[PDB]
């Protein structure tokens, strides 16, 4: 799909930020940048799922939750709990000005989300 | 009371955004720092237009629903003075998902540094004076 | 002057409200009629606080941002003498979305009949006397 | 979870609106009953677009701010079909704050009876179908 290309780019930029995070500590602004990277990467990802399922005659996907559940049920993703947690993080975005929320989101990004994003790209 | 707590959260968010902007006005930012600046602008503007909505509900106006209505009413009632900049803020918000293209991100970052920060500070000063 | 045209429109709205009230005092209202009475009250109060805002803008005051500021300034300036009932008016306005709960609607129509209408008439008289 | 409670409240508001619309179907309405009909449409629509917002937040979309964004997303994702009719709903709200016009008042009543009510009921049927528990 054409949106799969943009997803690969956004994920590439996200990988750059993650690879940088492993080597040295990130500043607050860089943590917010990683959160934004995850934002647009996950948007691209769940819209990829939506388009893939629409091409199979399924216009019943109404949002990222429906797409994530359908993909988990179709083996497109193996750990649906991680993607549910991703949805949870997306909804905490307006509250990243609180250090605790931002740190929680960043930790989830670096430990679990990146790997899931990469595995999803491999499958698509 | 409600709009005063929202205003305190807005003040914290604007402290963070001011740190970021002041960093941008002294040296060029990396792509990651530009994305972080965009995120900071996003949550600061969310707090700002929710502050407008809360304040106008407190005034007896319950017809405002979203950022558009809040911004227009704030412009009409004197809470903000440069409405076009806040409407462009809304347009920038609508472009958040396309910040992975560096052109969009650069445009939004320029708008944040050159215009949005001054407007946020002016709004913070105005609202604080109405407590 | 702007506040005088606003006062004419407010007089029209208050006359409609007076019709609705006199009906309420002649016989009980159905639920739909109560919703209509609430709507008429909302028209009247919107026009009233906009009259206040315009009048104060004629006096060189631009710090009126809504119905609350307008009511507080009208009380401080003597345009209204019972600011508590107008604060209650603001409360009733802000309850508009919940009038499908008939207890809320009943409270609002009770306030309209027993208090708000008389205050609107007194405010009309005051502004006509300026 | 939150959109389900909102949906229940919306169903009650719609019931009141249905009573008025069916009454108008049997006989003409007085000017007072017409204003009551507008009031019924206003608190029905207010709940309706908040159901859209709450549901899309449940779906993971926290970008919706107002009734405009909520209606657009509902049409895009299939929760509603007559996008234009719902956009017309939005500009029919808050006429208490936009002066007064009798002709306009009558046209909104006609639109409420002939189009809006049906859109509300279809939206209720769709959202209730998407509910699975509680």
């Amino acid at each position: 799909q054409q949106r799969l290309n943009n997803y690969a780019r956004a994920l590439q930029q996200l990988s750059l930020a993650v690879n940088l995070a492993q080597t040295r500590p990130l500043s607050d602004l860089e943590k917010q940048g990683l959160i934004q990277a995850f934002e647009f990467t996950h948007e691209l990802a769940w819209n990829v799922m939506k388009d893939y399922f629409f091409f199979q005659g399924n216009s019943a996907i109404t949002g990222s939750r429906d797409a994530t559940r359908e993909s988990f049920n179709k083996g497109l993703i193996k750990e649906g709990e991680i993607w549910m947690e991703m949805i949870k993080s997306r909804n905490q975005t307006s509250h990243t000005y609180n250090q605790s929320v931002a740190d929680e989101i960043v930790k989830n990004i670096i430990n679990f989300y990146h790997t899931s994003f990469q595995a999803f790209l491999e499958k698509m | 009371v409600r709009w005063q707590q929202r205003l305190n959260n807005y003040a914290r968010a604007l402290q963070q955004l001011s740190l970021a902007v002041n960093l941008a006005q002294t040296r060029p930012l990396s792509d990651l720092e530009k994305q972080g600046l965009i995120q900071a602008f996003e949550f600061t503007h969310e707090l700002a237009w929710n502050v407008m909505k809360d304040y106008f509900f407190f005034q007896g106006n319950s017809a405002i629903t979203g950022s558009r209505d809040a911004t227009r009413e704030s412009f009409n009632k004197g809470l903000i003075k440069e409405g076009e900049i806040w409407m462009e803020m809304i347009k920038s918000r609508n472009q958040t998902s396309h910040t992975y293209n560096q052109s969009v991100a650069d445009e939004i970052v320029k708008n944040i540094i050159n215009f949005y920060h001054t407007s946020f500070q002016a709004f913070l000063e105005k609202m604080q004076g109405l407590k | 002057v702007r506040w005088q045209q606003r006062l004419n429109n407010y007089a029209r709205a208050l006359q409609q409200l007076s019709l609705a009230v006199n009906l309420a005092q002649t016989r009980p209202l159905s639920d739909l009629e109560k919703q209509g009475l609430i709507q008429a009250f909302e028209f009247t109060h919107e026009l009233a606080w906009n009259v206040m805002k315009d009048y104060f803008f004629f006096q060189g005051n631009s710090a009126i941002t809504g119905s609350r500021d307008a009511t507080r300034e009208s009380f401080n300036k003597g345009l209204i003498k019972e600011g508590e009932i107008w604060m209650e008016m603001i409360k009733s306005r802000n309850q508009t979305s919940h009038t499908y709960n008939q207890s809320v609607a009943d409270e609002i129509v009770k306030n309209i009949i027993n208090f708000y209408h008389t205050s609107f008439q007194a405010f009309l008289e005051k502004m006509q006397g300026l | 979870v939150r959109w389900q409670q909102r949906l229940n409240n919306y169903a009650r508001a719609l019931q009141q609106l249905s009573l008025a619309v069916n009454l108008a179907q049997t006989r003409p309405l007085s000017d007072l009953e017409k204003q009551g009909l507008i009031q019924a449409f206003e608190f029905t629509h207010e709940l309706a677009w908040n159901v859209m917002k709450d549901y899309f937040f449940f779906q993971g979309n926290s970008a919706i701010t107002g009734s405009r964004d909520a209606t657009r997303e509902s049409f895009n994702k299939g929760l509603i079909k007559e996008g234009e009719i719902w956009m017309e709903m939005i500009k029919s709200r808050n006429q208490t704050s936009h002066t007064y016009n009798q002709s306009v008042a009558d046209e909104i009543v006609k639109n409420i009876i002939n189009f809006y009510h049906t859109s509300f009921q279809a939206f209720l049927e769709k959202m209730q179908g998407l509910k699975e528990h509680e």
Partner: protein, 104 residues
Amino acid sequence: QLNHLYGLPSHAIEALKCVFKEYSQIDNAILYGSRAKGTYHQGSDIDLCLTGNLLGITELLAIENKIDDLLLPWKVDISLKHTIDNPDLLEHIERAGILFYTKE
């Protein structure tokens, strides 16, 4: 701050004229209110009255939705001419109204 007429920038006036050009039923549009009197402040409304005979409330609400989509900061109060029965408002439009747009 850089305005053209009625305290509005040129692009705002033209954007509104653009939206009126989509409707052949609009014979013209007359600006009234504070921006026609010069008694306007920075965030003052834009009061416009659409003169047209084929214009119904349907087009009225559609135009309002399009204006809203322009993402202008000012509020626009749009109203059809033949749908007004307020003698005072009519008097003001015919006395102080400025021709804001004309269909050609």
